[PDB]
Amino acid sequence: RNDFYCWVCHREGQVLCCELCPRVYHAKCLRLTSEPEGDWFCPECEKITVAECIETQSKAMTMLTIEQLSYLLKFAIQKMKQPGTDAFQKPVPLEQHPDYAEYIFHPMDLCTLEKNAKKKMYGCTEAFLADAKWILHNCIIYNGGNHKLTQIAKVVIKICEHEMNEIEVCPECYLAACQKRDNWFCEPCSNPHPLVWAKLKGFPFWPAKALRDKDGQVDARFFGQHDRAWVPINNCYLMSKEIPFSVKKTKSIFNSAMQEMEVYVENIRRKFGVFNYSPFRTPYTPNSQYQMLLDPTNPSAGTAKIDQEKVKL
Ligand SMILES: [Zn+2]
Ligand SMILES: [Zn+2]
Ligand SMILES: [Zn+2]
């Protein structure tokens, strides 16, 4: 049953209908080349389609069954359900809001979202976020964009977006960080993240995992603190024995980071049999293979084939 309120701006008016879902849109809100002719699927349905196509699913999704994704969405829900989100934890009751269904054609709340996830209804992170966004749309429609509840619903969505992004960067990292087992940061992932010296401007060189490469920036997760930052690629070296010296305020904190990295290297050598340190100041390059080479003096031989286990995660 189609919505009356634009998915983008949350206002009524003349609105286009999606063929696949009940969302509607002002044409003007979509900034189109021209209005659609007939077969039209909205930006949410389009995203979901691209994300759920096996050939073009993310690295994260290729890693994961629908049931494994559902486990991770359960962790995301628990972050969304934090103290102060009470108003959104259960369906809106008609007792308190007798006219709710006159405005809100697709109710949603955190308990429904959680149940849906447990039932394996979501095929990708995009689909989970698209559904959670009904909570904010509905809040704005019914209560108004400047209502205090809208602040809360906005934070719930920003949390969801954050958690979905983390799943997509690396589902194995995400699960490890969620469960916080003993030395969780020292567990190598199935396609292990290269270790780098990473220098954020104004910060000392520090050991990190390189999680992804986007246009000249590296997404680095630092040993010790386990914080993150985009780092310019030319400020990232492959891990080496020789340390790029920086003046630092606390030696003990840097020591704890190096110790953690040492355990990680022991663990990767156990898991894959290899870890190659680089000559000092060797530039990190995207999708770096160096550390996983069987013979680092013979890069054409690549990484060793030992493998055909189903439980890769
Ligand atoms: Zn609009
Ligand atoms: Zn749609
Ligand atoms: Zn990972």
Residue numbers in the entry: 86 to 392, 394 to 399
Would you copy out the relevant sentences from the publication that reported this structure?
To better understand how multivalent interactions involving more than two reader domains impact recognition of PTMs, affecting protein function, we studied the topology of the N-terminal triple reader domain architecture found in the zinc-finger MYND domain-containing protein 8 (ZMYND8), which contains, in addition to a PHD/BRD arrangement, a Pro-Trp-Trp-Pro (PWWP) domain within a PHD/BRD/PWWP cassette. ZMYND8 has been previously found to participate in transcriptional regulation complexes (Eberl et al., 2013, Havugimana et al., 2012, Kloet et al., 2015, Malovannaya et al., 2011), is implicated in gene silencing (Poleshko et al., 2010), acts as a DNA damage response element (Gong et al., 2015), and has recently been proposed to control, together with KDM5C, enhancer activity (Shen et al., 2016). Here, we resolve the crystal structure of the triple reader module (PHD-BRD-PWWP) of ZMYND8, which forms a stable unit capable of simultaneously recognizing multiple histone PTMs while presenting a charged platform for association with DNA. Here we report the structure of the triple N-terminal reader modules found in ZMYND8, which form a stable ensemble capable of simultaneously engaging histones and DNA.
The 1.7-Å crystal structure showed that the PHD domain packs next to the BRD domain, whereas a zinc-finger motif linked the PHD/BRD and PWWP modules. ZMYND8 contains the conserved asparagine responsible for Kac peptide docking onto BRD modules (Filippakopoulos et al., 2012), a feature missing in the ZMYND11 BRD, which, instead, contains a tyrosine residue and was not found to recognize Kac (Wang et al., 2014, Wen et al., 2014). The distribution of charge on the surface of the ZMYND8 structure revealed highly charged patches as well as a large hydrophobic area on the back of the PWWP domain. A C-terminal extension necessary for expression of the three protein modules packed onto this hydrophobic area of the PWWP domain, inserting bulky hydrophobic residues (F360, Y362, F365, and Y369) into pockets formed on the PWWP surface. The interactions of the C-terminal extension with the PWWP domain explain the necessity for its presence, conferring stability to the triple reader modules. In addition, an aromatic cage (residues F288, W291, and F307) similar to ZMYND11 was found to be present, suggesting potential binding to methylated peptides. Intriguingly, the C-terminal tail of a crystallographic neighbor was found to be inserted into the cavity of the PWWP cage. Superimposition of the mouse ZMYND11/histone 3 trimethyl lysine 36 (H3K36me3) complex established that the C-terminal tail residue K396 of ZMYND8 mimics H3K36me3 insertion within the cage, suggesting that ZMYND8 may be able to bind to unmodified lysine residues.
